[PDB]
């Protein structure tokens, strides 16, 4: 969880998603596998971030190529990994991005 939510918080900070950034530090601090010094570091960094800026912010199958949900009903599907890729990004890959099996 620590890597997941640190990456999520970093993405939120780099993408101006401070609501998700706060939702990320909440879980990051609440994680039980962290040292007290590490908790203090996370709390101090969150304090600096949220004094700088406001904390308040502004299932379907998932495309392997770009993580966006596959809205369209007709979509390219892999023959092995059983995970689809959008019709606008199928032609770019000569093998399935998830499993590197041949496209087709």
């Amino acid at each position: 969880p620590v890597e997941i939510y640190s990456l999520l918080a970093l993405c939120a900070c780099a993408s101006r998603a401070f609501g998700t950034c706060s939702k990320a530090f909440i879980k990051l601090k609440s994680l039980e596998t962290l040292s007290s010094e590490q908790k203090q570091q996370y709390e101090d960094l969150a304090l600096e971030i949220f004094t700088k800026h406001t904390s308040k912010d502004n299932k379907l199958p998932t495309c392997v190529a770009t993580g966006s949900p596959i809205t369209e009903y007709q979509f390219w599907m892999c023959s092995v990994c059983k995970h689809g890729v959008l019709a606008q990004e199928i032609s770019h890959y000569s093998f399935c991005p998830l499993c590197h099996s041949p496209v087709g």
Partner: protein, 730 residues
């Protein structure tokens, strides 16, 4: 448990056991605990059928009782044992609000939804039903905790507010409000809520919370005002009021320390000390629980008083207050370390050694205690045993790196760097990724720099510049390397006059400009935290200005160094900087007088490199003024305090040349040539010449070959040395 079965009343509670002994009757909860423990033990024993039979016995017996729901929970647990999710869900769904332990059953419902099916909406609706069926603050707080677990802070805050509205004051619940508001990082509304609370009929606990919050995000004045308003209460003898006043006084002292009022902080800490003394007197009989906590708080108060006295340079009262704090709590390693550090500061080796021995008895590794004891006994010049202590600590804990760094420094001052790499061996043995550890990288860079390969040492340092702890020291070392890579005497002119034409290469000036630019870029990376850090940053910025070789910049650095020296008395780095500024600007007599003053003070374990630079520059001045005797004395001093100072050995070789001590000059030049990693062809030239004069032709030829391999174009060596040595072989 089977013997417990035979206990009276442990068979069908309510079977008309007319013993007329309704004082030792088996409590229903106790009996259910016995049965559940037996079921769990049998399940661990593999008797699944027997455990199920006992569970059925419990269900049959306790039907219609308050504890019966718990049994069903255990039954649901059995389903979780069997993996039948739907069976457990139905069993817990049978639980209704009227029955006791309903909250536990529905919480288990929610946990099963969350862990297995991961239905966040169902996980929410479980606690929503809990809140709706029992409108109590407990249910609403549980719902808020659920939302915080699903990471929906806004609805969690709404639920918390509903909880604190169901009971308007509720005491502790109000404080929970603030913590919730402080956890979701909604700081502005948290401040408003604290102000609203404080405005009416609330006790100073919310005052403490608001003061802590204001301190956290840097509004010192408002925190001080709130603390003073809350502390204006009369000195009530109530114990709780005493503890509240003590903690508020401590926090106000921290506020004053933050906003730079030392005397007020000390007065507040003294008042807190008196309050804590009263608390310690009362609690030993009035509250058995708080005795260790109050003792530790008193120890912390005394430690803070002593630290601020140190900040005021009142060392005796600092020692007294550390002794008081240690009396309050003897197991505080940090206070012991601070006391040892002050004992070292007061130049009292005996007390520091005693504290180090006590701390090492308390804990064998205690890296910092090893640091202080090793430094103390290095002051005794017992190099071998201090190296032994550091080596034993490193061989016991190869992961340690700061100990490794201090070992590298001690070995460099001992001139025994050859043993450095082997440690790396087991440093690499413990972890295959140990080469990626910032501490190991920093130590490797330090070793490479001390052996005389600045570029690769700088590259190794680079990988440690991003460390949380090693970053600052790594940046310092990169700045030092870039500003002056050749490790020559800044402002010295004993050899600069000998380098009249060699320094005319424009590539040297371009490299100097590039290094200065890189150092200025690195300066922005540094983030000083204390006043000492800012002083160090200013000192090295002044050094960077000096390296720019701009007369206006040099004079500005001179003025800044003079101001810093006036600000901090007897500051060795400032004295060295201002003396170098006088030297470069040709204010030579002023530099001579300043270095005469500097040499009077004694060497210390913190400013060793500044001391060495000062002594080297003074030796430069003396040699320029033909004062060979005292220059020789100072150079011997510098070599005594460090056994691998290449410049000192080169100066000694030059001195022995001036007296035609060809053997001694050859030895010194050889040592300098070895420790410089043969990157200075001029030193090799001098060394080969000294061998040639001493009639040692083969060694002269060897050194000439080494120099020419290092630099095939280095002139005046083929004929003036090599050819003459070759002609004199027979």
């Amino acid at each position: 448990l089977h013997m417990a079965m035979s206990l009276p009343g442990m068979k069908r509670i309510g079977a008309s056991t007319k013993s007329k002994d309704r004082k030792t009757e088996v409590d229903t909860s106790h009996r259910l605990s016995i049965f559940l423990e037996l079921i769990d033990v049998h399940r661990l024993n593999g008797e699944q059928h027997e455990a199920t039979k006992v569970l059925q016995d419990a269900i049959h017996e306790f039907s219609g009782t308050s504890e019966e729901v718990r049994v069903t929970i255990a039954n649901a647990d059995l389903a979780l044992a069997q993996g039948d999710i739907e069976r457990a869900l139905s069993i817990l769904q049978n639980v209704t609000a009227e029955q006791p332990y309903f909250i536990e059953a529905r919480e288990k419902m929610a946990d099963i939804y969350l862990k297995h099916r991961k239905d966040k909406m169902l996980y929410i609706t479980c606690f929503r039903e809990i809140a709706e069926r029992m409108a109590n603050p407990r249910s609403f707080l549980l719902l808020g905790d659920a939302y915080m677990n699903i990471l929906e802070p806004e609805e969690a805050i709404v639920a918390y507010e509903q909880a604190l509205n169901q009971n308007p004051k509720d005491g502790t619940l109000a404080s929970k409000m603030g913590k919730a508001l402080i956890k979701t990082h909604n700081y502005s509304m948290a401040i408003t809520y604290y102000e609203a609370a404080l405005k009416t009929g609330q006790k100073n606990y919310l005052c403490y919370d608001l003061a802590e919050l204001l301190l956290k995000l840097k509004w010192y004045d408002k925190a001080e005002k709130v603390l003073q308003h809350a502390l204006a209460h009369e000195p009530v003898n109530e114990l709780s009021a005493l503890m509240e006043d003590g903690r508020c006084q401590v926090l106000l002292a921290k506020v004053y320390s933050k906003m730079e009022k030392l005397g007020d902080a000390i007065t507040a800490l003294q008042q807190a000390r008196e309050l804590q003394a009263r608390v310690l007197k009362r609690v030993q009989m009035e509250q058995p629980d708080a005795v260790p906590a109050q003792k530790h708080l008193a120890a912390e108060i005394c430690a803070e008083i002593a630290k601020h006295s140190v900040a005021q340079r009142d060392y005796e009262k600092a020692i007294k207050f550390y002794r008081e704090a240690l009396v309050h709590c003897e197991t505080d390693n940090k206070i012991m370390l601070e006391l040892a550090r002050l004992y070292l500061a007061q130049d009292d080796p005996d007390s520091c050694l005693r504290q180090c021995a006590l701390l090492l008895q308390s804990d064998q590794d205690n890296e910092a205690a090893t640091m202080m004891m090793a430094d103390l006994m290095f002051r005794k010049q017992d190099y071998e045993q201090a190296v032994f202590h550091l080596q034993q600590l490193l061989e016991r804990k190869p992961d340690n790196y700061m100990t490794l760094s201090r070992l590298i420094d001690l070995l460099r001052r001992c001139g025994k760097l050859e043993d450095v790499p082997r440690f790396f061996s087991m440093a690499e043995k413990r972890n295959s990724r140990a080469k990626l550890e910032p501490g190991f990288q920093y130590c490797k860079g330090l070793y490479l720099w001390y052996t005389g390969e600045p570029n690769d040492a700088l590259r190794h340092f680079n990988k440690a510049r991003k460390d949380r702890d090693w970053g600052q020291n790594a940046l310092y070392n990169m700045i030092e390397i870039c500003l002056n890579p050749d490790n020559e005497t800044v402002g010295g002119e004993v050899f600069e006059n000998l380098d009249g034409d060699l320094g005319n290469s424009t590539e040297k000036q371009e490299s100097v400009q590039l290094a200065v630019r890189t150092a200025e870029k690195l300066l922005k990376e540094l983030k000083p935290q204390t006043v000492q850090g800012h002083v160090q940053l200013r000192i090295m910025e002044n050094y960077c200005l000096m390296a720019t070789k701009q007369k206006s910049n040099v004079e500005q650095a001179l003025n800044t160094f003079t101001e810093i020296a006036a600000s901090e008395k007897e500051h060795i780095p400032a004295l060295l900087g201002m003396a170098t500024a006088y030297m470069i600007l040709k204010q030579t007599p002023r530099a001579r007088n300043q270095l005469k003053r500097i040499a009077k003070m004694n060497w210390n374990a913190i400013d060793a490199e500044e001391f060495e630079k000062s002594w080297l520059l003074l030796a430069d001045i003396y040699i320029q003024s033909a004062k060979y005797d005292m220059a020789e004395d100072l150079l011997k001093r510098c070599l005594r305090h460090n056994r691998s100072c290449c410049k000192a050995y080169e100066y000694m070789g030059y001195i022995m040349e001036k007296e035609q001590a060809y053997t001694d000059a050859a030895l010194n030049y050889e040592m300098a040539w070895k420790y410089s990693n043969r990157t200075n062809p001029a030193v090799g030239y001098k060394l080969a010449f000294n061998y040639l004069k001493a009639k040692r032709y083969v060694d002269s030829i060897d050194i000439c070959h080494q120099v020419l391999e290092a630099h095939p174009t280095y002139p005046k060596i083929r004929k003036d040395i090599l050819d003459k040595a070759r002609a004199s072989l027979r």
